[PDB]
Amino acid sequence: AEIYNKDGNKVDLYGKAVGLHYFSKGNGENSYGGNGDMTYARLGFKGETQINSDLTGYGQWEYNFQGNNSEGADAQTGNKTRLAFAGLKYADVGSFDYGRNYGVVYDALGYTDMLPEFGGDTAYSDDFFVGRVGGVATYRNSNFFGLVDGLNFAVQYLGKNERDTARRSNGDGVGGSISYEYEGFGIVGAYGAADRTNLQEAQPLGNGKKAEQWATGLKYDANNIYLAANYGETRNATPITNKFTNTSGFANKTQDVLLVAQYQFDFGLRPSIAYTKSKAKDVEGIGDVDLVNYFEVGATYYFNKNMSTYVDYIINQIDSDNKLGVGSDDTVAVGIVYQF
Amino acid sequence: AEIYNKDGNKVDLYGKAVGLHYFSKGNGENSYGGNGDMTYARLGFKGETQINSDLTGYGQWEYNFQGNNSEGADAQTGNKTRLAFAGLKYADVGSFDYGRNYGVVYDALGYTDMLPEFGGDTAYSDDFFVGRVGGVATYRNSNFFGLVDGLNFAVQYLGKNERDTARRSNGDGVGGSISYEYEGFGIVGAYGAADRTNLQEAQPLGNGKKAEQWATGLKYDANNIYLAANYGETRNATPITNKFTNTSGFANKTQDVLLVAQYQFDFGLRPSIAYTKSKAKDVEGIGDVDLVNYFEVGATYYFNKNMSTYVDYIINQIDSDNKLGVGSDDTVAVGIVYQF
Amino acid sequence: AEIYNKDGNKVDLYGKAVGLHYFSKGNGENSYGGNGDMTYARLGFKGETQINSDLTGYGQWEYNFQGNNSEGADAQTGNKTRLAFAGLKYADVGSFDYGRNYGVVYDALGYTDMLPEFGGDTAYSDDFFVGRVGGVATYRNSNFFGLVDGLNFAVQYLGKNERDTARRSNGDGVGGSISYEYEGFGIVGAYGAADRTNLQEAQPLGNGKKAEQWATGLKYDANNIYLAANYGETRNATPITNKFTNTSGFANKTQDVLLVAQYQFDFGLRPSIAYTKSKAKDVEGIGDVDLVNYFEVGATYYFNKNMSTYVDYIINQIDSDNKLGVGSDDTVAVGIVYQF
């Protein structure tokens, strides 16, 4: 919500409360999303200041507050900042921001990250360029310097983050994206590559000094219809775990396909169907093994722009013998959302 | 404060800063509330969206920020989310919200939870239905479908929460409350029952597979006067600790009595007197033992709706030989509060 | 930003997003400020309520949200409340607030704490009176009861805080400050003394039962110019570590000098030069040793009151043989800031 607009500075304080429950058989440990309370909240601000007719400064901060923890020793489990960046945008030249922000490969993966609760499986947090990540400097350009309607490109530098776990670390890297949208249709490509840390190279799974992620998208978002597909591959980038041996690392190679189709009815119902499959190859000791494999049926009803409720069913196609121990059981999510 | 009201959506951003100090003899370890700085802050939002003439969506989130921690390794001690839920309310049919919210037995215990700083001893957090707890779905009904002025009832389902400590866990359960208010007087009853987890059943103190909590209330809240009483009992529900053996568990049986009397003077002074006693029975190795036993003398001065100050003295009647090692010393609280 | 002003109560919701990176050779472990992403955000409120023509109530809360952590197990590293206090101010009699607030010796050290990113080296958090600290009651007086233009004084009581580390603890104490400002010039003195806890007295470094801190300031803040100097000394108060032996404690004696010079150009550029040196004496096993020793060159450009970017270079003069192992290498910070 826009709570302040004076002297060329506008501030948007936003947030939501999501009452959320997951249903899965038994513990949910062998299921797609687990079982139990999953309630959480969000808080954020987005600011915009008019520096002059051609220059605009901006910043944003976004936090996740879990609502399924006790008030005791686990009070903080799963709380974190999601976004924290500031930047400048000038005329048609382009914009530059630095901070914690979405990796550039998410410009493609965003096409299919549209499901009520799930989906976007390959857009991992703190996983180089596929998702939210810290210390990224990002140049973006809209309509190619103002000369070509609908053509956009982005270049992003990723600073090295040497963290205490291999899962959340990364080295220096550079990535980019290009997208063109014309009359309902959209197509987009993005590529990113970066060094791996000594800690990552020391993990049992994944072998190499370089990480690579790329993805292409095709979408149609015209006349209440939404159709989108993604394809992508990664090298030494997708985080995996062998639950049998309790071995963590990265997949040497992955192949990912994401499809989504949705329709928005005028009375507020938005049915959703989707398919996602992520297979891994050349995993030490295993070889080929599916990481994600499911169909999705769900729907969201929108009471208005502030209130909505949704159901999300995952028809999980992972088999019970999966060599990494990926969960094979189904998961259904039910939620009620208030946002401002 | 209402910081946004447009297009049928209104948002309330609230919070407070409480400068707070406790005085107790010596170190305060053997006292009712301890000793030292107890400053803290609150931040929250409450939202309300008009879906139509009869339907109203809503959400709320509330956080506690301790202000008596260093900026180092203990920076987070005692920080937690207190409330996080969203819901819908329709006409006179009733309202339903899910998330972290007050257990239904608090509908009764609220009568006496009115002291400046202390009191409400039996409304434990993450203790089934007596206080704030996660993953509760709650239906409430005002004026019995619009047919009976002043008669309210509520039904609440508690999802199972298998946490890493028995103190903060719970199984599935159902509870309810009923209340009637007519011209200053209020009477209310509430009951709740739920399964215990394997972790709770494994604790030295407390024996049984089921937990039970109930409470009744009588109050008068007319003409600057406030008088209220609560009585209640619990089975295998009230959390207790034997400090001698460092044994934690639940009390097999408790009996609780809470009394409060207050008057609000027009110039801003609100004196308060109270009595609270909670005795436990059939505690393994102990038998009967008082958990809470004190008189309270205090007062709040209200400068206006935003500023207030208060003193709160606990005349602690727990004796020094108490078999569980409950603190026997007095405690005085002094505080200054800014809220918006 | 002032997001609410009604019925005599005004609320200022503020915050910022700082995109920040440090450059230092290698890891930065042997450097002044380290190396890597240092992005962070702030959120805060400041409230003011008119009780009557002569009385005003107020409160403030301020939190630091780090933006250089993953979304995993380290999500909370470095998050903390910075300020949390409420108070009353009456006419010319004075103001009183209690809570977590700036120690009174910061009234002097503030003169030089003016650098874009660094500086203010001797204003340690949770270090008695030199910086932010919890449980302090503070009386302040402006213009000596309204009788003497420009003369201010402050008296502060520090409650004992027995924490789990000697670094962040303190005993009871009292301190004060006095300042006089006339036509661009400012001079200020402050002194504070307090008991040490048993845990602090048990540390290998630092010997004594009392802690003492004092500082004087001379500043000129007129006609776009800012010049300021500080000098100060401390006894058993400045926290130190011997990295060779991994021994933590306090410095028996320190001598600190801080100089800053800046000019604000009308087009938004504010160049900054500074010097800071803090030497320690009679450190057990070491004797005399420099704690801080550097020159500073930097600058901030102000696009307007909401947007700014800055560079901050530390010409580190600490030598590589320093007996405590204090870092000898340089550090450069680059940042982009959005605030509201």
Curated annotation (Swiss-Prot), chains A, B, C:
Ranges per topology, Extracellular: 24-38, 67-82, 101-134, 160-171, 196-210, 236-252, 282-291, 316-330
A Pfam family: Porin_1
GO MF term list: colicin transmembrane transporter activity; disordered domain specific binding; identical protein binding; lipid binding; lipopolysaccharide binding; monoatomic ion channel activity; porin activity
Stated induction or repression of this protein's expression: By growth in low osmolarity conditions (low sugar or salt); activated at low osmolarity by OmpR, repressed at high osmolarity by OmpR (at protein level). Levels of OmpF protein decrease in a lon/ycgE double disruption (at protein level).
Keyword line: Cell outer membrane, Ion transport, Membrane, Porin, Protein transport, Signal, Transmembrane, Transmembrane beta strand, Transport
Disulfide bonds: none
Chief subcellular location: membrane
Function recorded in the entry: Forms pores that allow passive diffusion of small molecules across the outer membrane. (Microbial infection) It is also a receptor for the bacteriophage T2. Is the major receptor for colicin E5.
Similarity comment: Belongs to the Gram-negative porin family.
The protein, known as: Outer membrane porin F
